[PDB]
Amino acid sequence: SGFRKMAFPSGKVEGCMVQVTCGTTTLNGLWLDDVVYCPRHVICTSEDMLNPNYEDLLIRKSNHNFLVQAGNVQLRVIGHSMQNCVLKLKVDTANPKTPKYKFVRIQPGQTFSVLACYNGSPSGVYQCAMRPNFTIKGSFLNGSCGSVGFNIDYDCVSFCYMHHMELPTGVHAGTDLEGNFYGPFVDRQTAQAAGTDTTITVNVLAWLYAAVINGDRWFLNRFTTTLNDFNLVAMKYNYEPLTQDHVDILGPLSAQTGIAVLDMCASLKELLQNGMNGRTILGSALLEDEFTPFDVVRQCSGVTF
Amino acid sequence: SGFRKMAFPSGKVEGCMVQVTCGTTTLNGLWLDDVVYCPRHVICTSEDMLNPNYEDLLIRKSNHNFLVQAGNVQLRVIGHSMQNCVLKLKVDTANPKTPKYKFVRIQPGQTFSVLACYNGSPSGVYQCAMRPNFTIKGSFLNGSCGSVGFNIDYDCVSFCYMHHMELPTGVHAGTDLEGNFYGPFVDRQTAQAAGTDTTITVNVLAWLYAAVINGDRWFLNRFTTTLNDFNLVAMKYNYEPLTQDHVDILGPLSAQTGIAVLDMCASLKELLQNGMNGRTILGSALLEDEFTPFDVVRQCSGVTF
């Protein structure tokens, strides 16, 4: 029992973190096999970031301009290229600590763990979600660029995020490990504002199922609803529209608890319309949306890696 | 920017987790140098836990009755003993992944990371606090006993907790790594109720300082207070009494923000008396008390290990 915001164990990723320095700029890179991946803005000065031409800036760089350090394991750079907004630095040594891994591009609503690092050295780990507006709500200070987000399924680390930018509103933007930004964001210090921070409805519902499993039961009511009726309410409260696909994903949690998905939607509708009345659910005074159905099943059944 | 509930990177501890089986019971152990530490209740059946005599139960056990597996690294048990509520299993091989470590017994109010494990295999990591009533609010399923709590300072892992028991109220009890329970709890399935879940006042204040550092500023008011006046209020709301020692610990955060500790106490007093009025602080609708002053400084300055 109990339910916590739970990150993946970080050891497999810790072993892949390196420091990358190019002239004046130090950030983090990810060493997998004989390639180091890092943000391309490692080649930029502060002033360059107002309007960088990355192809032109990179013409002034050779392999030897990139200093890569794994702890004190100093790595030899033997090739470089740009792929979208990441650099790939080919080194002469394959990382011996390389875990089984894949690169995935996640959808808004999906959750992942972040290993926040500075100067190649991991500082902490926390859990977050790709928001519907394609930002993440992280914890990143200067030097954290190149820190990565990931999921682990038994043997396999699925890397989904590399940190690149903090927006003026203090939320975070970055890329998949192919270097494509999530959402419309760019690696330029510019006017980039985030869209609506909508609530991930299917995650809220998952968390209510988690709540029930733990004896937090007060919000169950007498009511049901329909998808269309519930969605009128979601729209008012800037919640994502719920689809039958979402209902299907919640099927296992429904089956476990014997609470029909549409009955849990009717509970959620009442919470939206009436609030919490100063009560709490799983230690929260607001409706939490950064646990997925899969997250709830994992934590409630003790899946290991 | 941003502020998250942030665990220590778990790799150093992942390398120390093993499976311990004695007859029918499998839980987790911690392998440091040539010793495996685990809950003594590994020797108990379900039925034994209603009223175990551990010295007598252990008379029926020899070294070969303890099966210890590190991944598939099968370890050879060459000695055993009981120390308070833990068993120490001497093995014939020193763990090659042993980090620099110490054993500490923490005070209520202190925070630590937990690596939740099953069958010797780590599942996730989250951050929690020793509550004033000496319980922790964790996430533990059957098989998680022997999972550990720790802090990391650069090179050194300070182990402070080993999980032993879930109480009927779904909160958690356990030991330091010398096997002494925190609080009055015992390793027997009995009537054990938790005392008052009081709020860790100095942690709340630390978190308000964290909030200010991030632009969450709305709760700053015109008022000040005194220690004695504030404490009349703390008592009403089942908050720990604030001491001058606590004020001193908050000195760095005061100096950083230029907000006097007693002025932040006056802000907290208003939040207690008036509530949040449906507003949020650092993504929370209630006053968070599981970040220490040291936690806030760490996360706000990017300390690494």
XYZ file of C-alpha atoms in Angstrom:
610
model
C 0.000 0.000 0.000
C 0.677 3.672 -0.463
C 1.146 5.349 -3.800
C 4.097 7.655 -4.565
C 5.466 9.561 -7.543
C 7.948 6.839 -8.464
C 10.877 7.163 -10.896
C 12.698 4.304 -12.560
C 15.945 3.228 -10.886
C 18.535 5.387 -12.559
C 21.683 3.205 -12.482
C 21.525 2.096 -16.107
C 21.395 5.721 -17.233
C 23.964 7.043 -14.676
C 26.539 4.834 -16.415
C 25.909 6.672 -19.739
C 26.322 10.263 -18.545
C 29.353 12.207 -19.670
C 30.527 15.815 -19.740
C 30.856 17.627 -23.085
C 32.833 20.839 -23.424
C 33.277 22.860 -26.575
C 35.256 26.053 -26.027
C 33.418 27.860 -23.221
C 30.258 25.708 -22.884
C 29.904 22.578 -20.708
C 26.797 20.425 -20.705
C 25.823 16.771 -20.514
C 25.961 14.051 -23.089
C 24.658 10.469 -23.363
C 27.235 7.803 -24.254
C 25.734 4.701 -25.886
C 28.055 2.253 -27.616
C 30.651 4.459 -29.447
C 28.444 7.573 -29.821
C 27.899 10.539 -27.503
C 24.629 12.428 -28.022
C 24.317 16.019 -26.808
C 22.418 19.287 -27.574
C 23.829 21.057 -30.609
C 23.828 24.332 -28.677
C 26.998 23.107 -26.935
C 28.704 24.928 -29.874
C 27.028 28.280 -29.019
C 28.162 31.107 -26.803
C 25.579 32.991 -24.711
C 25.388 35.633 -27.434
C 25.112 33.066 -30.243
C 21.801 31.802 -28.764
C 19.898 34.959 -29.741
C 20.080 33.907 -33.439
C 22.463 30.968 -34.140
C 23.255 29.557 -37.621
C 24.244 26.101 -36.530
C 25.663 24.864 -39.865
C 27.921 27.931 -39.982
C 28.961 27.699 -36.305
C 29.748 24.024 -36.728
C 32.064 24.721 -39.751
C 34.486 26.272 -37.237
C 34.574 23.024 -35.158
C 36.690 19.885 -35.593
C 36.695 16.582 -33.657
C 39.422 17.855 -31.317
C 37.298 20.886 -30.276
C 34.942 18.520 -28.411
C 36.212 17.472 -25.009
C 34.370 14.472 -23.625
C 34.952 13.145 -20.101
C 33.285 10.152 -18.494
C 34.144 10.669 -14.886
C 37.862 11.020 -15.597
C 37.577 8.420 -18.416
C 38.698 10.953 -21.116
C 37.147 9.897 -24.485
C 38.660 10.446 -27.914
C 36.344 12.091 -30.463
C 36.858 10.584 -33.945
C 33.890 12.030 -35.876
C 31.010 14.428 -35.459
C 27.751 15.262 -37.123
C 24.546 17.111 -36.636
C 21.156 15.405 -36.683
C 18.271 17.887 -36.234
C 19.053 19.643 -32.938
C 21.492 17.055 -31.561
C 25.155 16.361 -32.143
C 26.451 12.828 -32.481
C 30.092 12.534 -31.392
C 31.672 9.246 -32.475
C 34.292 8.211 -29.921
C 36.953 5.549 -30.102
C 35.652 3.532 -27.139
C 32.265 1.799 -26.769
C 30.699 2.529 -23.399
C 31.120 -0.727 -21.383
C 28.139 0.260 -19.224
C 25.827 0.628 -22.257
C 22.410 -0.834 -21.230
C 20.059 -2.454 -23.718
C 18.235 0.610 -25.032
C 15.928 2.111 -27.660
C 15.029 5.648 -28.765
C 11.354 6.497 -28.721
C 9.358 9.605 -29.369
C 6.583 9.804 -26.789
C 3.073 11.204 -27.073
C 1.674 13.990 -24.860
C 0.280 12.396 -21.730
C 3.102 9.852 -21.408
C 5.306 9.932 -18.300
C 9.027 9.367 -17.947
C 11.861 9.673 -15.420
C 14.496 12.421 -15.605
C 18.037 12.069 -14.353
C 19.065 15.647 -13.717
C 22.822 16.033 -14.272
C 25.469 18.757 -14.033
C 28.959 18.638 -15.599
C 28.376 14.964 -16.477
C 27.509 14.055 -12.871
C 23.884 12.910 -11.988
C 22.288 14.955 -9.117
C 18.788 13.499 -8.807
C 15.905 11.677 -10.318
C 12.238 12.581 -10.610
C 9.166 11.633 -12.613
C 7.359 13.906 -15.124
C 4.999 13.970 -18.090
C 4.975 15.310 -21.606
C 2.302 17.982 -21.251
C -0.387 18.391 -23.978
C 1.274 21.688 -24.969
C 4.618 19.783 -25.401
C 6.429 21.315 -22.467
C 7.567 19.435 -19.395
C 7.417 20.705 -15.857
C 10.957 19.898 -14.705
C 13.703 20.929 -12.312
C 16.657 22.146 -14.285
C 19.395 24.707 -13.463
C 22.129 26.125 -15.704
C 24.377 23.266 -16.848
C 21.573 20.663 -16.901
C 21.161 20.637 -20.707
C 21.743 17.181 -22.140
C 20.089 15.491 -19.142
C 17.753 12.755 -20.413
C 14.288 11.307 -19.805
C 13.616 7.618 -20.052
C 11.424 4.639 -19.267
C 12.665 1.155 -18.299
C 10.948 -2.118 -19.319
C 12.822 -5.044 -17.674
C 16.083 -5.064 -19.628
C 15.483 -2.096 -21.892
C 15.982 1.655 -21.418
C 13.720 3.656 -23.768
C 15.151 7.138 -24.045
C 12.500 9.689 -24.939
C 13.805 13.165 -23.926
C 16.926 15.324 -23.945
C 16.763 18.678 -22.162
C 17.560 21.774 -24.253
C 15.647 24.951 -23.181
C 13.956 26.808 -20.346
C 11.125 29.127 -21.401
C 10.479 32.472 -19.610
C 7.539 30.909 -17.716
C 10.010 28.461 -16.120
C 8.800 25.317 -17.976
C 11.044 23.126 -20.102
C 11.433 22.186 -23.730
C 13.557 19.579 -25.448
C 14.002 16.888 -28.050
C 13.725 13.162 -28.629
C 17.074 11.417 -29.084
C 16.854 11.993 -32.865
C 17.056 15.708 -32.076
C 13.495 16.720 -33.048
C 11.910 19.092 -30.548
C 8.680 18.157 -28.905
C 6.073 20.706 -29.938
C 6.924 23.926 -31.821
C 9.937 24.943 -29.777
C 13.359 25.914 -31.145
C 16.913 26.068 -29.786
C 17.044 29.854 -30.000
C 16.455 32.383 -27.206
C 13.307 33.916 -28.665
C 9.657 34.655 -28.001
C 8.324 31.125 -27.510
C 5.178 30.856 -25.446
C 3.480 27.622 -24.337
C -0.081 26.795 -25.304
C -2.856 25.904 -22.845
C -1.719 23.620 -20.000
C -4.566 21.194 -20.334
C -5.129 18.354 -17.873
C -4.453 14.732 -18.911
C -7.931 13.257 -18.207
C -7.058 9.559 -18.697
C -4.200 9.977 -16.162
C -6.493 11.622 -13.606
C -8.850 8.662 -13.925
C -5.965 6.207 -13.540
C -4.950 7.995 -10.343
C -8.480 7.817 -8.967
C -8.384 4.029 -9.540
C -5.000 4.030 -7.670
C -6.758 5.946 -4.836
C -9.510 3.364 -4.557
C -7.048 0.479 -4.479
C -5.590 2.310 -1.359
C -8.761 3.014 0.651
C -9.197 6.545 -0.574
C -12.849 6.007 -1.549
C -14.813 9.116 -0.432
C -15.169 10.545 -3.973
C -17.119 7.512 -5.263
C -20.702 8.635 -5.805
C -24.091 7.311 -6.956
C -23.793 8.723 -10.502
C -22.826 7.607 -13.985
C -22.355 9.578 -17.179
C -21.611 9.110 -20.855
C -18.520 9.972 -22.938
C -20.276 12.900 -24.618
C -21.741 14.219 -21.352
C -18.436 13.882 -19.511
C -16.632 15.630 -22.380
C -18.859 18.707 -22.098
C -17.446 18.979 -18.565
C -13.828 18.178 -19.514
C -13.958 20.999 -22.061
C -15.162 23.560 -19.472
C -12.292 22.675 -17.097
C -9.572 22.484 -19.811
C -9.308 18.735 -19.628
C -8.349 16.613 -22.655
C -11.439 15.027 -24.375
C -11.852 11.389 -23.264
C -11.960 8.859 -26.123
C -13.050 5.247 -26.294
C -9.358 4.402 -26.711
C -8.800 5.935 -23.229
C -11.733 3.939 -21.843
C -10.169 0.743 -23.246
C -6.794 1.545 -21.690
C -8.505 1.853 -18.295
C -10.135 -1.575 -18.711
C -7.673 -3.462 -16.447
C -8.091 -0.935 -13.642
C -11.869 -1.123 -14.051
C -11.721 -4.950 -13.900
C -9.476 -4.904 -10.815
C -11.677 -2.530 -8.830
C -15.093 -3.423 -10.299
C -15.751 0.299 -10.863
C -16.941 0.958 -14.408
C -14.939 3.584 -16.239
C -18.013 5.783 -16.833
C -18.879 5.582 -13.110
C -15.338 6.843 -12.326
C -15.912 9.608 -14.920
C -19.064 10.604 -12.986
C -16.926 10.797 -9.809
C -14.406 12.984 -11.631
C -17.220 15.200 -12.977
C -18.441 15.852 -9.425
C -14.879 16.643 -8.246
C -14.509 19.155 -11.117
C -17.854 20.804 -10.433
C -17.731 20.786 -6.610
C -14.001 20.536 -5.797
C -12.418 18.589 -2.925
C -14.162 20.455 -0.073
C -10.835 20.690 1.736
C -10.343 16.889 1.561
C -7.391 14.953 0.098
C -6.765 12.027 -2.268
C -3.500 10.051 -1.971
C -1.929 12.946 -0.087
C -2.942 15.555 -2.717
C -5.363 18.460 -2.541
C -5.643 18.650 -6.357
C -6.338 16.121 -9.102
C -3.006 14.593 -10.149
C -2.464 13.858 -13.889
C 1.158 12.633 -14.136
C 0.456 8.972 -13.591
C -0.508 6.848 -16.641
C -2.761 3.723 -16.452
C 0.429 1.710 -17.072
C 2.167 3.552 -14.170
C -0.677 2.658 -11.789
C -0.613 -1.051 -12.813
C 3.208 -1.137 -12.465
C 3.259 0.391 -9.019
C 0.217 -1.579 -7.806
C 1.669 -5.002 -8.963
C 5.417 -4.517 -8.149
C 6.873 -4.908 -11.664
C 10.716 -5.094 -11.609
C 13.686 -4.449 -13.941
C 13.956 26.686 -12.312
C 11.167 24.413 -11.210
C 11.179 22.418 -8.019
C 10.389 18.679 -7.908
C 10.337 15.901 -5.328
C 13.819 14.672 -6.212
C 15.398 11.360 -5.144
C 19.091 10.567 -5.148
C 20.355 8.653 -8.188
C 19.942 5.051 -7.174
C 22.766 3.276 -9.058
C 25.112 2.936 -6.095
C 22.379 1.209 -4.102
C 21.011 -0.909 -7.023
C 24.401 -2.653 -7.089
C 23.930 -3.761 -3.432
C 20.476 -5.338 -3.706
C 20.168 -9.085 -3.405
C 17.432 -11.658 -2.862
C 17.286 -13.592 0.428
C 15.246 -16.762 0.786
C 14.878 -18.834 3.914
C 12.504 -21.765 3.486
C 9.266 -20.209 2.215
C 10.027 -16.468 2.604
C 11.768 -14.256 0.008
C 12.678 -10.647 0.670
C 15.468 -8.196 -0.070
C 18.883 -7.830 1.429
C 21.693 -5.247 1.248
C 25.144 -6.575 0.314
C 28.014 -4.380 1.532
C 31.529 -5.799 1.496
C 31.140 -9.467 2.659
C 27.915 -8.982 4.677
C 24.263 -9.168 3.629
C 21.830 -7.278 5.874
C 18.146 -8.221 5.870
C 15.036 -8.171 8.151
C 15.137 -10.942 10.729
C 11.538 -11.831 9.886
C 12.881 -13.597 6.778
C 12.990 -16.620 9.169
C 9.235 -16.374 9.956
C 6.260 -17.982 8.298
C 3.010 -16.000 7.971
C 1.740 -17.674 11.136
C 4.988 -17.077 13.046
C 4.483 -13.284 12.722
C 1.552 -13.239 15.162
C 3.981 -13.917 18.069
C 7.533 -14.910 16.974
C 10.374 -15.906 19.356
C 13.238 -15.003 17.098
C 16.064 -16.578 19.149
C 14.147 -19.872 19.163
C 13.212 -19.710 15.453
C 16.803 -18.935 14.552
C 18.105 -22.028 16.480
C 16.511 -24.128 13.716
C 18.528 -22.275 11.000
C 22.066 -22.883 9.724
C 24.163 -20.972 7.151
C 22.971 -23.263 4.347
C 19.284 -22.443 5.065
C 19.873 -18.906 3.735
C 19.825 -18.668 -0.037
C 21.309 -15.431 -1.312
C 21.243 -14.446 -4.993
C 22.688 -11.305 -6.533
C 21.077 -11.324 -9.914
C 22.194 -14.879 -10.666
C 25.473 -14.262 -8.753
C 24.692 -17.020 -6.155
C 26.462 -16.110 -2.853
C 27.806 -18.552 -0.289
C 26.680 -17.917 3.302
C 29.519 -18.631 5.770
C 28.121 -17.184 9.022
C 24.996 -15.604 10.422
C 23.933 -13.574 13.394
C 21.156 -11.459 14.717
C 21.612 -7.809 15.652
C 18.401 -6.252 17.048
C 15.817 -6.814 14.297
C 18.261 -7.462 11.442
C 20.216 -10.490 10.324
C 23.805 -10.194 9.184
C 24.746 -12.936 6.708
C 28.506 -13.185 6.176
C 29.196 -14.343 2.619
C 32.388 -15.559 1.030
C 32.564 -12.796 -1.593
C 32.879 -9.028 -1.033
C 30.434 -7.102 -3.190
C 32.585 -5.550 -5.984
C 29.963 -2.823 -6.448
C 30.134 -1.773 -2.766
C 29.946 2.077 -2.703
C 31.611 4.152 -0.007
C 28.919 4.080 2.674
C 27.951 4.749 6.293
C 25.050 3.730 8.548
C 23.170 6.561 10.184
C 20.123 6.794 12.359
C 18.080 9.788 11.237
C 15.903 12.155 13.242
C 12.187 12.759 12.576
C 11.902 15.465 9.955
C 14.843 14.191 7.889
C 14.221 13.063 4.302
C 15.711 10.175 2.372
C 15.316 8.252 -0.893
C 13.818 4.752 -1.052
C 14.714 2.164 -3.647
C 11.680 -0.085 -3.676
C 12.718 -3.648 -4.571
C 11.077 -7.039 -5.115
C 12.870 -10.420 -5.148
C 16.219 -8.578 -5.107
C 15.313 -6.495 -8.177
C 14.844 -2.637 -7.820
C 11.448 -1.375 -9.181
C 11.513 2.357 -8.451
C 12.804 5.234 -6.459
C 11.012 7.947 -4.514
C 11.683 10.486 -1.785
C 10.153 10.423 1.736
C 10.547 11.662 5.296
C 10.770 10.190 8.753
C 7.496 11.459 10.197
C 7.396 12.898 13.768
C 5.443 9.795 14.848
C 8.288 7.598 13.407
C 6.357 6.146 10.509
C 7.119 6.767 6.861
C 4.574 7.282 4.139
C 5.903 4.863 1.514
C 4.907 2.673 -1.408
C 5.540 -0.920 -0.521
C 3.837 -4.167 -1.656
C 4.334 -7.726 -0.393
C 7.951 -8.753 -1.024
C 9.365 -5.229 -0.550
C 10.767 -5.859 2.957
C 14.504 -5.265 3.083
C 14.275 -2.326 0.655
C 16.430 0.530 1.980
C 16.380 4.306 2.436
C 19.465 6.396 1.952
C 21.061 9.770 1.348
C 24.075 10.435 -0.908
C 26.786 13.049 -0.189
C 29.244 13.106 -3.145
C 31.034 9.779 -2.719
C 29.175 8.439 0.289
C 25.894 6.532 0.657
C 24.397 7.021 4.144
C 21.930 4.226 4.735
C 19.262 5.199 7.238
C 16.252 2.853 6.741
C 15.348 -0.775 6.090
C 11.689 -1.597 5.464
C 10.080 -4.155 7.800
C 6.319 -3.572 8.445
C 3.071 -2.157 7.105
C 0.613 -0.971 9.761
C -3.190 -1.369 9.315
C -3.487 2.339 8.401
C -1.241 1.661 5.377
C 1.843 3.563 6.666
C 5.270 1.998 7.076
C 7.637 1.111 9.870
C 11.225 -0.066 9.859
C 14.721 0.014 11.269
C 18.091 1.691 10.912
C 20.808 -0.584 9.531
C 21.737 -1.629 13.098
C 18.271 -3.182 13.297
C 16.686 -0.785 15.826
C 13.158 0.231 14.873
C 12.327 3.857 14.459
C 9.730 4.756 17.067
C 7.947 2.153 19.232
C 7.183 -0.353 16.507
C 7.933 -4.089 16.613
C 8.352 -6.876 14.052
C 5.199 -8.659 15.181
C 1.723 -8.495 13.616
C 0.008 -6.806 16.547
C -2.014 -3.786 17.599
C 0.439 -0.998 16.769
C -1.109 2.381 16.126
C 0.732 5.520 14.974
C 0.738 8.702 17.016
C -0.315 12.129 15.715
C 0.887 12.864 12.162
C 2.246 16.275 12.947
C 3.560 18.618 10.259
C 7.312 19.306 9.957
C 7.245 23.130 10.325
C 10.908 23.823 9.443
C 10.420 21.835 6.190
C 7.282 23.787 5.278
C 9.249 27.007 5.716
C 12.106 25.656 3.593
C 9.605 24.853 0.845
C 8.133 28.345 0.983
C 11.668 29.727 0.457
C 11.965 27.287 -2.527
C 8.647 28.735 -3.825
C 9.928 32.291 -3.658
C 13.151 31.411 -5.456
C 10.779 30.185 -8.300
C 8.401 33.156 -8.631
C 5.695 31.708 -6.456
C 5.427 34.844 -4.294
C 1.690 35.511 -3.686
C 1.744 34.283 -0.054
C 4.282 36.926 1.058
C 2.426 39.407 3.247
C 2.987 42.604 5.254
C 3.258 40.815 8.627
C 5.899 39.541 11.018
C 5.600 37.456 14.161
C 7.686 36.048 16.980
C 8.712 32.459 17.818
C 6.303 32.291 20.758
C 3.421 33.852 18.807
C 3.998 31.617 15.792
C 4.172 28.558 18.062
C 0.713 29.248 19.500
C -0.486 28.835 15.903
C 1.693 25.795 15.098
C 0.218 24.038 18.130
C -3.393 24.666 16.997
C -2.685 23.181 13.541
C -0.613 20.196 14.804
C 2.642 21.614 13.556
C 5.970 20.895 15.286
C 7.075 23.797 17.606
C 9.660 25.997 15.839
C 12.947 26.419 17.736
C 15.808 28.859 17.371
C 17.837 25.913 16.057
C 15.303 25.689 13.172
C 15.583 29.442 12.589
C 19.385 29.083 12.368
C 19.111 26.226 9.874
C 16.977 28.467 7.642
C 19.609 31.230 7.755
C 21.103 30.496 4.294
C 17.678 30.515 2.652
C 16.844 33.759 4.457
C 20.142 35.302 3.262
C 19.572 34.148 -0.329
C 16.056 35.561 -0.584
C 16.363 38.515 1.825
C 13.161 37.350 3.558
C 13.628 37.170 7.321
C 12.692 33.838 8.830
C 10.080 35.406 11.144
C 8.516 37.216 8.157
C 8.201 33.818 6.397
C 6.656 32.457 9.632
C 4.063 35.267 9.436
C 3.295 34.166 5.845
C 2.895 30.575 7.025
C 0.646 31.714 9.904
C -1.697 33.424 7.431
C -1.756 30.312 5.191
C -2.683 28.168 8.230
C -5.406 30.540 9.383
C -6.865 31.443 5.964
C -5.826 28.533 3.708
C -4.791 28.746 0.044
C -8.069 30.207 -1.288
C -7.967 27.700 -4.135
C -4.456 28.849 -5.172
C -1.296 26.735 -5.558
C 2.365 26.821 -4.489
C 4.959 24.914 -6.559
C 2.190 22.814 -8.081
C 0.660 21.889 -4.681
C -2.667 22.793 -3.118
C -1.408 21.954 0.402
C 1.654 22.915 2.431
C 4.413 20.407 1.635
C 6.694 19.272 4.520
C 8.963 16.593 2.984
C 11.702 18.905 1.823
C 14.452 19.846 4.333
C 16.390 23.179 4.239
C 19.357 21.112 2.995
C 17.148 19.583 0.236
C 16.109 23.051 -0.970
C 19.744 24.308 -1.065
C 20.853 21.127 -2.905
C 18.183 21.335 -5.559
C 18.476 25.126 -5.940
C 22.342 25.025 -6.391
C 22.750 21.787 -8.463
C 24.925 19.773 -6.047
C 26.243 16.539 -7.664
C 27.518 13.082 -6.617
